[PDB]
Scaffold this active site. Structure first.
Site, PDB file in Angstrom:
ATOM      1  N   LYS A  28      13.377  -0.878  -1.324  1.00 53.38           N
ATOM      2  CA  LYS A  28      11.998  -0.633  -0.929  1.00 53.38           C
ATOM      3  C   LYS A  28      11.658   0.802  -1.324  1.00 53.38           C
ATOM      4  O   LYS A  28      12.314   1.743  -0.890  1.00 53.38           O
ATOM      5  CB  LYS A  28      11.874  -0.820   0.584  1.00 53.38           C
ATOM      6  CG  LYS A  28      10.486  -0.636   1.166  1.00 53.38           C
ATOM      7  CD  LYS A  28      10.534  -0.988   2.650  1.00 53.38           C
ATOM      8  CE  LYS A  28       9.175  -0.948   3.308  1.00 53.38           C
ATOM      9  NZ  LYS A  28       9.276  -1.444   4.711  1.00 53.38           N
ATOM     10  N   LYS A  74       0.809  -1.214   0.000  1.00 50.82           N
ATOM     11  CA  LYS A  74       0.000   0.000   0.000  1.00 50.82           C
ATOM     12  C   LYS A  74       0.846   1.269   0.000  1.00 50.82           C
ATOM     13  O   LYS A  74       0.488   2.266  -0.629  1.00 50.82           O
ATOM     14  CB  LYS A  74      -0.937  -0.002   1.214  1.00 50.82           C
ATOM     15  CG  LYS A  74      -1.881   1.189   1.278  1.00 50.82           C
ATOM     16  CD  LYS A  74      -2.962   0.982   2.332  1.00 50.82           C
ATOM     17  CE  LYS A  74      -3.931   2.156   2.372  1.00 50.82           C
ATOM     18  NZ  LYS A  74      -5.065   1.909   3.309  1.00 50.82           N
ATOM     19  N   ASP A 133       6.130  -7.040  15.300  1.00 48.80           N
ATOM     20  CA  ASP A 133       5.157  -7.897  14.630  1.00 48.80           C
ATOM     21  C   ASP A 133       5.966  -9.049  14.039  1.00 48.80           C
ATOM     22  O   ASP A 133       6.468  -8.955  12.918  1.00 48.80           O
ATOM     23  CB  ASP A 133       4.443  -7.132  13.511  1.00 48.80           C
ATOM     24  CG  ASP A 133       3.140  -7.791  13.098  1.00 48.80           C
ATOM     25  OD1 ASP A 133       3.156  -9.002  12.777  1.00 48.80           O
ATOM     26  OD2 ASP A 133       2.098  -7.101  13.097  1.00 48.80           O
ATOM     27  N   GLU A 141       4.796 -14.023   7.965  1.00 47.45           N
ATOM     28  CA  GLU A 141       4.847 -13.144   6.794  1.00 47.45           C
ATOM     29  C   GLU A 141       5.935 -12.064   6.906  1.00 47.45           C
ATOM     30  O   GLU A 141       6.378 -11.525   5.891  1.00 47.45           O
ATOM     31  CB  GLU A 141       3.488 -12.466   6.557  1.00 47.45           C
ATOM     32  CG  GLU A 141       2.312 -13.433   6.367  1.00 47.45           C
ATOM     33  CD  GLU A 141       1.583 -13.756   7.670  1.00 47.45           C
ATOM     34  OE1 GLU A 141       2.249 -14.037   8.694  1.00 47.45           O
ATOM     35  OE2 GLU A 141       0.331 -13.731   7.663  1.00 47.45           O
ATOM     36  N   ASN A 142       6.376 -11.760   8.124  1.00 47.21           N
ATOM     37  CA  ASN A 142       7.412 -10.733   8.307  1.00 47.21           C
ATOM     38  C   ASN A 142       8.808 -11.304   8.520  1.00 47.21           C
ATOM     39  O   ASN A 142       9.731 -10.577   8.904  1.00 47.21           O
ATOM     40  CB  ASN A 142       7.077  -9.816   9.488  1.00 47.21           C
ATOM     41  CG  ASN A 142       5.882  -8.934   9.222  1.00 47.21           C
ATOM     42  OD1 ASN A 142       5.520  -8.690   8.073  1.00 47.21           O
ATOM     43  ND2 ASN A 142       5.268  -8.433  10.290  1.00 47.21           N
ATOM     44  N   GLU A 180      19.095  -5.345   2.893  1.00 46.48           N
ATOM     45  CA  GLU A 180      19.805  -6.580   2.640  1.00 46.48           C
ATOM     46  C   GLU A 180      18.833  -7.475   1.856  1.00 46.48           C
ATOM     47  O   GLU A 180      17.621  -7.428   2.075  1.00 46.48           O
ATOM     48  CB  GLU A 180      20.173  -7.226   3.985  1.00 46.48           C
ATOM     49  CG  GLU A 180      20.504  -8.719   3.956  1.00 46.48           C
ATOM     50  CD  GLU A 180      20.841  -9.276   5.346  1.00 46.48           C
ATOM     51  OE1 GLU A 180      20.566  -8.593   6.364  1.00 46.48           O
ATOM     52  OE2 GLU A 180      21.367 -10.405   5.424  1.00 46.48           O
ATOM     53  N   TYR A 181      19.364  -8.272   0.940  1.00 50.54           N
ATOM     54  CA  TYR A 181      18.534  -9.185   0.161  1.00 50.54           C
ATOM     55  C   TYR A 181      18.547 -10.568   0.813  1.00 50.54           C
ATOM     56  O   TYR A 181      19.608 -11.109   1.101  1.00 50.54           O
ATOM     57  CB  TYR A 181      19.059  -9.289  -1.279  1.00 50.54           C
ATOM     58  CG  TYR A 181      18.286 -10.258  -2.146  1.00 50.54           C
ATOM     59  CD1 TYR A 181      16.925 -10.071  -2.383  1.00 50.54           C
ATOM     60  CD2 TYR A 181      18.904 -11.373  -2.705  1.00 50.54           C
ATOM     61  CE1 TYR A 181      16.196 -10.968  -3.147  1.00 50.54           C
ATOM     62  CE2 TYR A 181      18.178 -12.286  -3.480  1.00 50.54           C
ATOM     63  CZ  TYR A 181      16.827 -12.076  -3.691  1.00 50.54           C
ATOM     64  OH  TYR A 181      16.089 -12.971  -4.425  1.00 50.54           O
ATOM     65  N   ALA A 182      17.359 -11.118   1.061  1.00 55.25           N
ATOM     66  CA  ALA A 182      17.198 -12.451   1.653  1.00 55.25           C
ATOM     67  C   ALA A 182      16.710 -13.333   0.498  1.00 55.25           C
ATOM     68  O   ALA A 182      15.532 -13.327   0.159  1.00 55.25           O
ATOM     69  CB  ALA A 182      16.161 -12.401   2.769  1.00 55.25           C
ATOM     70  N   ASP A 231      10.379  -6.861  10.169  1.00 56.90           N
ATOM     71  CA  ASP A 231       9.094  -6.311  10.570  1.00 56.90           C
ATOM     72  C   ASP A 231       9.199  -4.795  10.742  1.00 56.90           C
ATOM     73  O   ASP A 231       8.645  -4.223  11.679  1.00 56.90           O
ATOM     74  CB  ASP A 231       8.628  -6.960  11.875  1.00 56.90           C
ATOM     75  CG  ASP A 231       9.359  -6.420  13.089  1.00 56.90           C
ATOM     76  OD1 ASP A 231      10.608  -6.516  13.136  1.00 56.90           O
ATOM     77  OD2 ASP A 231       8.676  -5.893  13.995  1.00 56.90           O
TER      78      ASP A 231
HETATM   79  C1  LIG Z   1      11.633 -20.914  -3.970  1.00 55.51           C
HETATM   80  N1  LIG Z   1      11.684 -19.438  -3.778  1.00 55.51           N
HETATM   81  C2  LIG Z   1      10.328 -18.833  -3.994  1.00 55.51           C
HETATM   82  C3  LIG Z   1      10.311 -17.287  -3.814  1.00 55.51           C
HETATM   83  N2  LIG Z   1      11.668 -16.585  -3.814  1.00 55.51           N
HETATM   84  C4  LIG Z   1      11.858 -15.285  -3.084  1.00 55.51           C
HETATM   85  C5  LIG Z   1      10.735 -14.468  -2.743  1.00 55.51           C
HETATM   86  C6  LIG Z   1      10.895 -13.260  -2.056  1.00 55.51           C
HETATM   87  C7  LIG Z   1      12.193 -12.806  -1.668  1.00 55.51           C
HETATM   88  C8  LIG Z   1      12.260 -11.498  -0.915  1.00 55.51           C
HETATM   89  O1  LIG Z   1      11.224 -10.883  -0.679  1.00 55.51           O
HETATM   90  N3  LIG Z   1      13.466 -11.010  -0.502  1.00 55.51           N
HETATM   91  C9  LIG Z   1      13.832  -9.810   0.245  1.00 55.51           C
HETATM   92  N4  LIG Z   1      15.060  -9.535   0.501  1.00 55.51           N
HETATM   93  N5  LIG Z   1      15.198  -8.362   1.200  1.00 55.51           N
HETATM   94  C10 LIG Z   1      13.878  -7.971   1.328  1.00 55.51           C
HETATM   95  C11 LIG Z   1      13.229  -6.787   1.976  1.00 55.51           C
HETATM   96  N6  LIG Z   1      11.790  -7.123   1.716  1.00 55.51           N
HETATM   97  C12 LIG Z   1      10.751  -6.337   2.164  1.00 55.51           C
HETATM   98  O2  LIG Z   1      10.966  -5.296   2.792  1.00 55.51           O
HETATM   99  C13 LIG Z   1       9.282  -6.782   1.935  1.00 55.51           C
HETATM  100  C14 LIG Z   1       8.952  -7.888   2.967  1.00 55.51           C
HETATM  101  C15 LIG Z   1       8.420  -9.122   2.736  1.00 55.51           C
HETATM  102  C16 LIG Z   1       8.289  -9.850   3.921  1.00 55.51           C
HETATM  103  C17 LIG Z   1       8.721  -9.169   5.033  1.00 55.51           C
HETATM  104  S1  LIG Z   1       9.303  -7.606   4.628  1.00 55.51           S
HETATM  105  C18 LIG Z   1      11.609  -8.397   0.948  1.00 55.51           C
HETATM  106  C19 LIG Z   1      12.991  -8.902   0.729  1.00 55.51           C
HETATM  107  C20 LIG Z   1      13.323 -13.611  -2.006  1.00 55.51           C
HETATM  108  C21 LIG Z   1      13.160 -14.824  -2.699  1.00 55.51           C
HETATM  109  C22 LIG Z   1      12.805 -17.251  -4.585  1.00 55.51           C
HETATM  110  C23 LIG Z   1      12.801 -18.812  -4.572  1.00 55.51           C
HETATM  111 AS   LIG Z   2      13.496  -6.356  16.987  1.00 56.77          AS
END
Ligand SMILES: CN1CCN(c2ccc(C(=O)Nc3n[nH]c4cn(C(=O)Cc5cccs5)cc34)cc2)CC1
Ligand SMILES: [As]
Ligand SMILES: [As]
Length: 263
Positions: free
Chosen positions: A37, A18, A131, A135-136, A86-88, A149
């Site tokens: 972001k 949003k 939170d 999902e977070n 950071e990328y996760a 979060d």
């Molecule tokens: C098998 N898999 C299926 C799906 N795959 C990914 C799906 C999603 C992601 C991903 O969102 N990675 C992120 N890295 N840093 C971030 C800051 N984010 C948010 O602020 C947004 C937020 C989302 C949740 C909490 S904060 C979000 C990210 C990586 C791999 C690849 C392979």
């Molecule tokens: As914390």
């Protein structure tokens, strides 16, 4: 270092929210892979949270822990605010939970340890009431938990009921009964989270939200036959009605079920 949009190339969307969106991105020079972001000042002001964004980015900016998603920097322009994160690579814990329906004890105890460690660090910095729903939570390249979060929705991935006081499923008795809260709310959240990890659903689910409120107040929840006695003891302790009687994070980290199952 003063970043600018020109310093990054943006890739595929990782999420749509949003307040804005989040994309895969690469920093021009180092070629490092990050997540960008993007928030719109328009929606921010409309909700009267323009100043609050910078203040929150300030505290988050200094939280350095392996299980807390790092917020590197930030910059903005006439209509948008950009957060360098950071990328996760392994995505959300929530998506993993949906794929498997529930987590085994070793995986769960491991996430609880990581969260308890992160919370411990935060509480010492006076950062509380987070939170921490599935999902977070994101996952690193080695599968380590990364708490993300920070808020300011730029993604979904579910329609779980939320309120100004927080996610309904995770609300503690004190918040439902009209009492002021403290950092002990995080222990209750940890109990709800552990339950959801092992069972696949929140412990106070009911036919109506009204009934959920009531069950939380009465701390009325039960376990499926497959949850072990060790898990039941920790969760039952975390979900105590009296906030002060919920275990200390140190006690969670040293709980027999945790030390026996956590990697
Ligand atoms: C098998 N898999 C299926 C799906 N795959 C990914 C799906 C999603 C992601 C991903 O969102 N990675 C992120 N890295 N840093 C971030 C800051 N984010 C948010 O602020 C947004 C937020 C989302 C949740 C909490 S904060 C979000 C990210 C990586 C791999 C690849 C392979
Ligand atoms: As914390
Ligand atoms: As409130």
């Amino acid at each position: 270092r003063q970043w600018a949009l020109e310093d990054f190339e943006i890739g595929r969307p990782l999420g749509k929210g949003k307040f804005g969106n989040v994309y895969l991105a690469r920093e021009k020079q180092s070629k490092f892979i990050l997540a960008l972001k993007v928030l719109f000042k328009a929606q921010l002001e409309k909700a009267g949270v323009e100043h609050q964004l910078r203040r929150e980015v300030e505290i988050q900016s200094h939280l350095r822990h392996p299980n807390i998603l790092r917020l590197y920097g930030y910059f903005h322009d006439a209509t948008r605010v950009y957060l360098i994160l950071e990328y996760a690579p392994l995505g959300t814990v929530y998506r993993e939970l949906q794929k498997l329906s529930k987590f085994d004890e070793q995986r769960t105890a491991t996430y609880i340890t990581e969260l308890a460690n992160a919370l411990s660090y935060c509480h010492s910095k006076r950062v509380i009431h987070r939170d921490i729903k599935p999902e977070n939570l994101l996952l690193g390249s080695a599968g380590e938990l990364k708490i993300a979060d920070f808020g300011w929705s730029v993604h979904a991935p579910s329609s779980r009921r939320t309120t100004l006081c927080g996610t309904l499923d995770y609300l503690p008795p004190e918040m439902i009964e009209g009492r002021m809260h403290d950092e002990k709310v995080d222990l209750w959240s940890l109990g709800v989270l552990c339950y959801e990890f092992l069972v696949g659903k929140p412990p106070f689910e009911a036919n109506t939200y009204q009934e959920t409120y009531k069950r939380i107040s009465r701390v009325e929840f039960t376990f499926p036959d497959f949850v072990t006695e060790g898990a039941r003891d920790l969760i039952s302790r975390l979900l105590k009605h009296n906030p002060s009687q919920r275990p200390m994070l140190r006690e969670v980290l040293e709980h027999p079920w945790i030390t026996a199952n956590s990697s």
